[PDB]
Every structure is written in C-alpha cells, then in structure tokens.
C-alpha cells in the first residue's frame, strides 16, 4: 500500500480523481453497484474501497466510517492517491418540520459541531461546499425529480447530546447544548449529520472540491432503504457531470 | 419614516422584496441609473436608498457604509420594510497572486473576521451566500464575459490589521492577526472585504437570501496602490454584473 | 491625498493635534461651527472632515460613520496626518432607570461587544478611557451644568440584538446576548452605544489619547421612542461639553 | 433483533455482563475475545463488531469503537444503555518520549483534549481523567506480565495527520493552532499520541462511569514515521493480554 | 536567599524532595509536628516554611496560601531549592449527598475554574494528579480507616460566585456560573476548593509529581455553616493521612 | 464572634468605616496604619491582618488581601459584607517601559485581565477599569507630595514568572499563550506587572463598589532592598494621602 490506513495504491484507481465517500462500509459495494464493472479493492478497519467505471471513467467509491476523525484519515490519504473531488452521500436526521422523510438534502455549508475540523481550519472559516460539487448535487437531484432542499447543516461530533437527544443512559445533555435544536432550527438549520463539517472544511482549506448530499429517514419534530437508494442514486448521478 | 435610520416607510418601496447594497453612498445613484425609473429615496448618514424598476419589478438600491455594524442596521431595517433578497456589490483586495486587478469574484462563504455576525449566530455557523444568489451572479458574470473566480471570501471588521497591512501609525499588527494573510492565503482564501460575513451571517440565520460579488482593486502580491482609472472600469463592470443577477432573482 | 479614505492631507490640518469624532456626517458642520473660522476640507464615504479654530489653535471634526469598522479607518487616517487626541461625540440608550433622557454621560471604559477592538489588542485588555481626557469631559459637563454620570459603557457591534431589541424582523436574540441587558444593568453599566470599545481600544494601546461623552435620547427601561425635539436639544448640550472639554486639553 | 440503534445488540445478547473492552479496530475484537473462555460473535455493523466471552465464569463483552471520538460516544453510549458501566479501552499509539521505545505499554491517567465529542458532555476545563480503579488493574496487570510501562499523560487527537503535527501530507502543512504543538506536549511530558481516550474518558468520568486506557508503542516520533509491522503485531498482542488481565481484576 | 519570596536557601532544605503544601499557614505548624525534629525556616507574606524529619529523610512544610496565584509562587520556588513532590492537604465544601462531613477525599484531577492553570498549559490539558501520590493517600486513607471518596475535584479561583454562592453583597452570580454546582453534581464531581487546578497543572506539566487531599467541613446539600469541634477534628484527621502518604513516597 | 468567614471581623469592629486601604503584604498593614491616628490591631487570620485606624476624625481600614485575585476576592466581599464600600490598593510592582524608573509611583486607570478570578464576576469583555473619584484622589495625592507619577493601563496577572515571562524558572520555559506576551504588552503601552489589580477593580466596578489602584516601581524589567523600603513607603504616603480626599 502506498497509504496507512486504506491499503491502496495509486495503481488501483487507475487515474481516478473522483471520490463517492458513504459514512457505512456497508453502503460501498451498493453505490458502486449503480456503475460499470463495479470491483472490491480493499477493506481495512471502518474503510471500505470499491472502484467503478461511470460513463468509461474510473471512480472510488470509499467509506469514511462515522464522525470527523475518521473521515479526515480517509479523505487526506484518498487525496495522497491523486482524489480531487470528494460527494459524501449520507443519512440525516431532519429538524425542521417542513422536510420529509424521504427528502434529499443538499448541504451548502454546516454548523461546525465538530473538532477536526479546528484542525484545519479555526473555527471563522467556514464548512462550505465547493460551488461546482453542490451544483451538481441540485441538478442531479431535479434530474431524478426528488422532492430536495438546500441549506445549512448541523454536523455534530456526537449523535446523542450533540443532537439533543434526551433518551440516553445519563438523561441528560451538557449546558453548551442544551436548547441547541431549537437555536439551529429558527436559524433554518436543516438537519443533524456527523460528518460534514470536517470533511467540508478540510477540503475547502486544502484546494479539494467537495460535495454532500443526505437521504431524510427521520425528522425530529415528528422507507429507510427507500430514503437511502435515493440518495444513492443522486450522488452517482452527479459525479457523472463532475467527470 | 417605518424604521429608525433610514427614513422609509414600507409604501416608499412600493413592493419591492429585492435590494442591492453597496458600502459606498455615491455607489446608490450609479447603480440606480443602469435600472428603469431610478428615483432617490432618502439619505440619512450613511445611508442613501434610491428605488429603481427591473423588467416591470421596483428594485431598492441602499448603502450600508462600511463595516457590520452600519450594514446589520440596513439589511435589518431593510427587511423590516420587506426585503427578501440582498445582493452586495464591493470593492476588494485579492491576496491570491492568480487572481488579476479587474477581476470579478463570487463569495460562496466568509472568513468570520468580524464582530456583527455573532450577534446572529455563534461563530461555528457558517457565513454561506443563498445558493440561488450565488448561481445568479456566477450566470451573471458569465454572461457579460468577465473574469470570474468563485471561493471564499475573507470579511474583515477592519481594512489595516485585520487584513495585515503593517504601513500605518504603530506600524504593528496584533498577535492574533500576525501571519494570517499567508494563512489565508493557503487555504485557497481570495480575498479581503469588510461586509459580507455580517450580511451573509445575519441572512442565512434569519431566512433571508443573500449574495455578495465584488471588484478586484488591488492584488496584495503585486502592488499596493489602486490605480485611478481601471477602479472605476471594475466598478462597472461588477455593477452590471449584480444588476443582471438581481433580474435572476426577481 | 495622503490617506486612503478620508481624503485629507498633512496641509488640510494646519497642523492640528486634536480630532472631535462624531458619528454622524451632518453632526461635523454643526461641531466646527461653535468654534472660530470653520472650513469644509473633504467629504468621501461617510467621512465628512471639517477644520475648526479653537483659542488660536487648529482643531479637526471628522465623521466615523455607525461602527468601529468606519471608526477604525478614520482613527488611523488621521493618527497618519498627526492627530494624537480623539474626543468621540455621541447618542446612546441608557439602560440605568436613574439616568434620564437629556442627561449626558462620560465613559471611562466600555464593554467590548465590537470585533474591531480585538484586531488592536486581545479581548482582556481595557477599553478604557485616556485620564485627561475623561478628567476634561467631566470638568467640561460641570462648567456648563449638566446632569452626568461617570461610568462603564456597553459598546455593542449591532443596534438591535447586541442591545436586545426584539422588536424586529426576526423577534429573536442570538442565546449570547439573551438576557444580556438585564446582565450589564446589574453590574452598572450606564448605557448602550456603537463605538467607543473600538475608539478606545485602538488609541489606548498604540499611546493615542482618547475621550468617550454622549447624550442620552432614550432610556431603554422608560421607553423605546425617542422624541424630536429634545434629540436636538440633547445633542447641542453635549457638542457644547465636547467642544469646551478639547479647549481643556490643547 | 437490537436494543439499540447502532450496535445491533439486545440487552439479552450481553447475558449480564457490565464490563467492556473497547479496540479501535473492528478486527481487533476477535483476537481480544480469543484470550477468554467460550468466544461467541454476537453482531456486525459499520465499525461495531461486537464479540462476547467469559471471563472467571463472568461475561465480558467486546465492542470496536471504530477511529475517533464520534463512534467510541455512540459504543460507549449503546453499550451504557444495555448494562455496560465499565470501559476498558485498548489502542495503538505514536510515542512522543524519547525514553519511550517500540513495544512499551502505556497506561493514561488523563487526556489532553484535542477532540470535539468531549465538549458534547462536559466543558474543556473538566479533566479527561481515567477511574482510579480502572488505573490500578491496568497498571497492575502491566507488571503482572511484565511489560516496559509508562504511566502518565496522553494527547488524544482528531486528526492522525495535522492534530499530531505531521507535515508528510497532501497539503504539507499544519494549522497555526498545531503548529509547534507536538514539541509543546513533549515539554509538558505528554507521552504518546492516540484518537479515542479523551471522548471516553470525558464521557465516563461525567456520566459516573467507570474508564480505564492502555497503549501499545508501535511508533517513536523522535525515532520513526513508518512503523515496524512484525513489532506492531507483538505489541498488539503484548498489551491485548494486559487488557483482558486487568479486566480480570474489575470483574 | 536563593528565592524572591520563600526566603530559603538550598542549604536550608538539606537536601529535601518532597514537600507537604497546605493553605493555612497556620497548618504549617501542626503537620510538621507530627514529624521527627520540627524547625521554623521562615515567615513571609503568606509563606510560613518549616524543615522535619520522617523515617530519617527530611520533609519540608510550606504554606501556599488561597488560591493559585500564590501556590504557583510557593510551588516554583520550592522546585528551585530541589522539590520535586508536592503534597497539598486542604479543607473543602462537598456538593455531592453522600458525601458527608468529615470524610477524606483524594482528587485524581480538577475542573479547572482558576486562571494560574493557564500560564503553565492550555485549558485542554488534564489537571491530574502522579499516580504514585494518589496511590499513596488512598493507601494512607486505608491505613488510618478513614470514610474516603475518590474522584473528581472543582478548583475555584473564588469562595463565593465560583461555587456558586448567593448569600454575598451583590446577591448573584455571573451568567457563566449560574447553575454551574448542579452541572458539576450531575458530572460526579465531589466537592469545591480552591487551589487543585493550579499545583495539579503546573506539576503534571513540569515533571513534577503532585497528590491531592481534603477533608470535609461543610456540605452544601446540607448545611451551609462549619460545625463546631468536627471541623478541628477534620483537619487532624485530614492531616495524618497526608504524612502517612509522604512515608509511601519517600 | 465573626459576622464573616475568613477575615474575623464583625460589623462593630469596622465603627461605620466605608473606606479600607489593601495591601498585597500582610506586614503592610501594621505601617500603612501607623501613618494614621490611634492604630489598633483587629483579626489576623490566614493571609488576612487587618488593623483599624482613623483619619481626620473619621475611621478608616486596612486589610492585606494576599497574593492573586482568590484570596484578594475574599477580602474585598467580605469587607463589602461588612460595610465598606471604598477599596485603594498599594502595591509593588516590575515596571516594563524603558522611561519608567525605579522608586517611580503608578496609578491604574485599568487592568489586562491575566487572572482568573475577574472572570467569576464579569465575562473578559468587561474592562477592569478603577472608580473615576479614586483614580483622581490618587493622582493628586501623588502630585502633594511631589513624586514621578505614570497613568496608564496595568497587566494584572495570576502568576508571577510565567504570566510575566520570566524564564529564569525551573522549567525555564513560557506557554505558547504567554510567550512573546511582555514584548506585545510593551508596544500596547501596558506600564507594569502586578497580581491582583484586574481581580480588584473588575470585582468592584460591575458591583458598585468604589476602587483605586496605586503601586511602586521597585523593579524594571527593560534593565534592591534599601530601594525597596523607600519605594513602598512613598506610595504608602500617597495610598493615606488619597484616603484623605476620599473620606
Ligand atoms: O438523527 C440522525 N442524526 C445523524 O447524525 N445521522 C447520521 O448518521 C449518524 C450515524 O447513524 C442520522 C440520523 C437519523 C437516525 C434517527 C434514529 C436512529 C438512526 O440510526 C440507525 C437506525 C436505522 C434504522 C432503524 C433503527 C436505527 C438514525
Ligand atoms: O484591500 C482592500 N480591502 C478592503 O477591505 N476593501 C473594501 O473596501 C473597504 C473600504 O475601502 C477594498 C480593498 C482594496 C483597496 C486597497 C488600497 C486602498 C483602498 O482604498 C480606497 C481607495 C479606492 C480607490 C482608489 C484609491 C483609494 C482599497
Ligand atoms: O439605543 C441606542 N443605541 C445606540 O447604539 N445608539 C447610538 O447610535 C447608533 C446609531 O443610531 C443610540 C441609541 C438611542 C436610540 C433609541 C431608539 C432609536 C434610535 O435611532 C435613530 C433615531 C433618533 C431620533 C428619533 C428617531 C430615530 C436611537
Ligand atoms: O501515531 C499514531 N497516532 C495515533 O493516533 N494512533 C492510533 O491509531 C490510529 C489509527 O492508526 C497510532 C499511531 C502510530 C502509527 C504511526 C504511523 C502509521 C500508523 O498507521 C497504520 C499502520 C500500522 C502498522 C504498520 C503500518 C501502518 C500508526
Ligand atoms: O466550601 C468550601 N470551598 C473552598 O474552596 N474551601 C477551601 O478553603 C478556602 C478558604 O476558606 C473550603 C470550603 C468549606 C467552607 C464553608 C464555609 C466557610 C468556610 O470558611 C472558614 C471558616 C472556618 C471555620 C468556621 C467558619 C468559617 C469554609
Ligand atoms: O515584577 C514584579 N511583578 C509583580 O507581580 N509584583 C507584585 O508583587 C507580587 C508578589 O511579590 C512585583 C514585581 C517586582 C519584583 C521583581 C523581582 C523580585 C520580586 O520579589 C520579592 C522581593 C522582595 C525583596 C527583595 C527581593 C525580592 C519583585
Ligand atoms: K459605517
Ligand atoms: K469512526
Ligand atoms: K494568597
């Protein structure tokens, strides 16, 4: 391997500059099961490599796992082996009462709930998407008639306190979140992820194009495979206009 | 007047849910006059409001001065009156050395340098233009065939230290701001400006669409002085660039 | 001009020492008017520089604009053309109930709700008021019999969140500053204005003297409108303070 | 089918264990359960691998938190709700020390906080402290077999590459805010670099749980980048023994 | 001297390496009693240093006074002289409900609500105590059959807002302390003092070894005024316990 | 016995005192009270001596704060408690600015807050500014007897070798946060160092209570014990003589 923790050589993207980046390992084979000769490249703790042709061109696609510091070890060694562009497909818990389950989101720029992206960035700069990567998304989304939202997201380091989610073990969230949700949401905050903040951030800091897009399977102030196919079926389809 | 600064009352705009909003005053007229029906409205301060007609829709034009803090009176006043849409128009100061005097730029998202934006938002929320806004002026841009480059914006809430400029009276830049134009700088960063992270901040928190294009002056790599002649092309040229994106938006 | 801004050279001065700093642009004319041989010099943005004799002794009234950005320019374009003694003339809301409307304040430091202040000096460094200067303005209050009080200013970057108004388009108040009023008001702070943290912030560490006086025009605990008349009445009374404070430091 | 949402375990599957040995990665899990008596997989998903085994008679459970502090706050959390309240993590880690060598043991008594998820339950200024107890059985577990340990202070990052200031990226640079910060740490006599200890020990010392942290050296800073992958399986193995001797001793 | 303020010689020590650190300077006179030959060194300011012997090695008793600032002083100036291990003994108020009167606690590390904390390492470093000294005073707690607690300590640059006290002048407490003793129960913390955060810091970063000790003279879920005979029994009892672990360390 | 905790006082003690000089040194008490008329021991508990005496009729206090804001944070609520609503400090202090002399005296209009204890009663953003009335009292009480006076802004910090950046240390090393710090506070025009002033005037101005802060230079840090004795004791005369005006 020319990398630590992926075990992939620049040899086995076969020129690839494009990244599909699922959070869930078990997500990989699915996406790449949308393209062309779709083949297993590699599996290394929470990172799961498959390359797929779309439209005769080579593409990864690469799980990240959950939260940011994981996502960080992938995308960085992902870029070492010549990624350029990285669309991170996700789920998402949605906050605002107008959005589905169902909907697709398309996140803009994110709410950095997070810490590794401090380490490529201070806190001022923000968790943009690149411009070309959220255009695509939008367009790919109306291509396939998908009932879509654009916006903010809140990308947290947690899935429980960090969301405000009560029913836990202790019962109870720490002071610097407490009343959040309802912050973020008259702020018209969209919805909870885990990994977008970082993975924006350290891409637009670093001369990386970056792209995020969600599948709504619950919505907090209120199918799954569905919700998750759909999403799956955008991503690919807007990787096509970004090769 | 409806509001506290600047003396219009919600009839003045006659329906008009999209404003520009330039830092500069005697901007308001020059944009106003690439428009149908420019009227002047008021001039109170900082703030000189002109109404203006695209394709049959009433447009305001009104100047925030410079900073966050007179733009967050305007843009709030401004929304309290009914606007919806506010597309900034400025001047700028590139610190990419790719990036030419006379270019145009697009900000996608701001550099939090200032000091207004966390009386909407704490830090961590991002200073993101409206995407519908953005695309207009990228269209916009391209369509009248201008150098154009899209990234993000660095919005200072001063125009010496805050952007590292070291020929001033001390001749000395606090610790915190030491270095940061080379920080900028490597994270790709286009830019210094003295508003948007304000008005990008205070819209995308409150439901408001905002976007922000501005004129290359200056490129802090090669020279410090603007010259006298090609600030008033680039001028210009952006303000046709956010009058074509506003008809987009109507 | 020797200044990016304020349109303004060395000459232009006279070689004058001290600066009356207003917010307000129509507020210069009126300043320079009570002193003797008053002559318009520039007016860019919303910088409006008037040239004033006081005792024999060139005197500078020069606009910041609403904000420590503006503030910000100003101060430093004319520390550039010698000026070395900034006395700020403002309005402000009290949020004391003993302080009444016409009252007249004098800040020895103020709370740092601005960004600008922090690209000068890190937030635990005071804003605080130049000894002479504040001893001038109180001494200047007492000659001419006004009633004033001595104290801490909040020096805040919006008008409406950061001095938790919810009379607005949103209703709402970012969770930093909710509750926030109730807060200053129990540890004395007399009043809410928009430029004295960056003002003195900025002079006190870079060996630059400056003063702090403003007008009360509304209490925030009595009521939220402010009346015509006695805005005006106001406003003379503390331009009088002002200009009788400069004569006390030339 | 599950209890909770992650995990993909029913409190039933646990059968009354309340301890839990908790690798970063998934394929880690087998090898910790081999040690004890009837290994038995219990479920598989994302980076949650979960094995149970027996201990003394009594169940212990082993769950992979995955990298980082965002999944060690989701295992720690699910396992919490299904009985689990104490927490032994075993990891791998880059020395700081240059009297540290490649296949030392080291025990964390408290986390330098360069994490996100800790904040999520507790504010910087609370220390990521491990259980006094949970120290002990580690410590003594260590000299029971007989390991070179360090017992001390551990700088628990986000970031494998610019959090623990390396420079041989695709970027080739650090942030101002960790530039010079790895020698920071060693003047501080911080001892080694990890990703999961500060999100757990935060998490357990302010939910009155109880959390323990053990190491082994694969890498010295001052000495390499690349690590030795023969002594890494021996370290491996060498502190994955301690681990399940010190869970012995809290049982 | 060999020291600013201690007013000790390296000769003076003979040769000590651990030191017993208490608040009280009248403590210094009863721990050092309790050891083999007991001798004042020096009185100044708030530093009483007295020289004894255990087990033939000799110890050094030295106050640091309330709070950080001083104890960063006393700890410092001790380490010149050639102590390399601290033991403080305090007294503390308990916020926990089973926690009670009288009982011994051992900090295995701090909350840090001190500002000294911070001029030795950033607030995310780990206030802990050596495991060597904890080890030692939770065997030293045993030995003597003590009711001991084991935990987490919140260490207060104040007596009064910081541990969240309302019966004072002002009657309140700062926003960032409002409702901080509830979230400091719900967290597991034991109890309130004053200078953990700083000897625990400044040595846990310096490659000094530093253990924690108090005993409980006050509950604040009880009641909130010290008992009689028991709070002098307490400190006696507390005091013991910190020789005993200085026997282990030696 | 005791109305309050820590100092052993009760409000009878005070006589209806409202103004209380602090020193830092509880060996300060005894002879800033010795300069006025009829000095008599009240408490000595910990750190905190304080000694009642009176001036120009009227009764005054001196109470020794300690070392650093907690301690100092204790006295001056406690005093509060017990009816004064006037604080002076005198203190000692290293001097930063090369033009600044030893034996020179130093009046604080305000303080960088490099403690901890300002924090507990108002956010950073708060300055650490002294009373108006007090600042005054003590400038003209330094020019009455004639001695070299700098105004201007203090660094108050929480220890004294790393927040003051001294490296002659054990460690001989300065956290990132304060390294370079000296240097930056110099160019800001910052005057001195000393430890409790920040704690003092922040605790007192968002509490309505009146303070003033004086100290005397016998250290310059840009470049002595019989020195030092003559040094405290002019600003000890003018600490009195600025009670004087304020009573
Ligand atoms: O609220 C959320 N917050 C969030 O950060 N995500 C993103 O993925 C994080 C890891 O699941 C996703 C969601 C939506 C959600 C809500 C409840 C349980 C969830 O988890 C897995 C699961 C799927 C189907 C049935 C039960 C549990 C996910
Ligand atoms: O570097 C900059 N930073 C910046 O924040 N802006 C935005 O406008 C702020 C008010 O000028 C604009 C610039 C470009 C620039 C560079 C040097 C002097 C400048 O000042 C006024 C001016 C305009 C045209 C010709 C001479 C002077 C402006
Ligand atoms: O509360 C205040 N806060 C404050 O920061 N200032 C300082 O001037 C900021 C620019 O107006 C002034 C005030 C007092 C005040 C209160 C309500 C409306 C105000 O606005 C303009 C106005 C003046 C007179 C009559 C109608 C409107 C001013
Ligand atoms: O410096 C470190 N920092 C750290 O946070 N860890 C903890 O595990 C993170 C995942 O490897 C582990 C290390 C040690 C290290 C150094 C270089 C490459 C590494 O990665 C994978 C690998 C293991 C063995 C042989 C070659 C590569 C690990
Ligand atoms: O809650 C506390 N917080 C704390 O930081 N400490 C540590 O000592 C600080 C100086 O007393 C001690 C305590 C316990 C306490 C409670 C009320 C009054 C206290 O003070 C001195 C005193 C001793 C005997 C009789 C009355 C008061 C001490
Ligand atoms: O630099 C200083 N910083 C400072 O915070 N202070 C205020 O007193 C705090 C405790 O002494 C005082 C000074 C001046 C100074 C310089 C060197 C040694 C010092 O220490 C005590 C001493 C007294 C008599 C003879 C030699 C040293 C004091
Ligand atoms: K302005
Ligand atoms: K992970
Ligand atoms: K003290």
Same mark, same amino acid.
């Given at each position: 391997?020319?990398?630590?923790?992926?075990?992939?050589?620049?040899?086995?993207?076969? $020129?690839?500059?494009?990244?599909?980046?699922?959070?869930?390992?078990? !997500? /990989?084979?699915?996406?790449?099961? #949308?393209?062309?000769?779709?083949?297993?490249?590699? %599996?290394?703790?929470?990172?799961?490599?498959? !390359?797929?042709?779309?439209?005769?061109?080579?593409?990864?696609?690469?799980?990240? $796992?959950?939260?940011?510091? %994981?996502? %960080?070890?992938?995308?960085?060694?992902?870029? @070492? #082996?010549?990624?350029?562009?990285?669309? !991170?497909?996700?789920?998402?818990?949605?906050? @605002?009462?107008?959005?589905?389950?169902?909907?697709? #989101?398309?996140?803009?720029?994110?709410?950095?709930?997070?810490?590794?992206?401090?380490?490529? +960035?201070?806190?001022?700069?923000?968790?943009?998407?690149?411009?070309?990567?959220?255009?695509?998304?939008?367009?790919?989304?109306?291509?396939?008639? +998908?009932?879509?939202?654009?916006?903010?997201?809140?990308?947290?380091?947690?899935?429980?306190?960090? @969301?405000? !989610?009560?029913?836990?073990?202790?019962?109870?969230?720490?002071?610097?979140?407490?009343?959040?949700?309802?912050?973020?949401?008259?702020?018209?905050?969209?919805?909870?992820?885990?990994? %977008?903040?970082?993975?924006?951030?350290?891409?637009?800091?670093?001369?990386?194009?970056?792209?995020?897009?969600?599948?709504?399977? /619950?919505?907090?102030?209120?199918?799954?495979?569905?919700?998750?196919?759909?999403?799956?079926?955008?991503?690919?389809?807007?990787?096509?206009?970004?090769?």
């Amino acid at each position: 391997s020319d990398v630590f923790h992926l075990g992939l050589t620049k040899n086995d993207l076969q $020129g690839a500059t494009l990244a599909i980046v699922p959070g869930d390992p078990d !997500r /990989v084979e699915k996406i790449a099961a #949308l393209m062309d000769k779709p083949v297993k490249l590699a %599996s290394h703790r929470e990172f799961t490599t498959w !390359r797929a042709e779309l439209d005769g061109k080579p593409v990864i696609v690469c799980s990240t $796992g959950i939260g940011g510091p %994981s996502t %960080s070890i992938a995308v960085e060694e992902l870029a @070492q #082996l010549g990624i350029r562009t990285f669309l !991170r497909i996700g789920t998402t818990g949605a906050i @605002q009462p107008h959005i589905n389950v169902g909907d697709v #989101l398309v996140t803009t720029a994110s709410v950095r709930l997070d810490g590794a992206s401090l380490h490529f +960035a201070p806190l001022e700069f923000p968790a943009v998407a690149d411009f070309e990567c959220t255009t695509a998304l939008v367009e790919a989304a109306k291509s396939i008639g +998908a009932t879509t939202h654009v916006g903010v997201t809140a990308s947290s380091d947690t899935f429980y306190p960090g @969301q405000e !989610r009560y029913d836990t073990y202790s019962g109870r969230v720490v002071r610097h979140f407490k009343g959040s949700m309802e912050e973020w949401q008259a702020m018209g905050v969209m919805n909870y992820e885990m990994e %977008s903040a970082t993975l924006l951030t350290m891409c637009a800091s670093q001369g990386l194009r970056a792209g995020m897009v969600a599948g709504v399977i /619950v919505n907090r102030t209120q199918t799954m495979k569905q919700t998750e196919s759909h999403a799956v079926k955008i991503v690919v389809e807007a990787a096509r206009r970004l090769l």
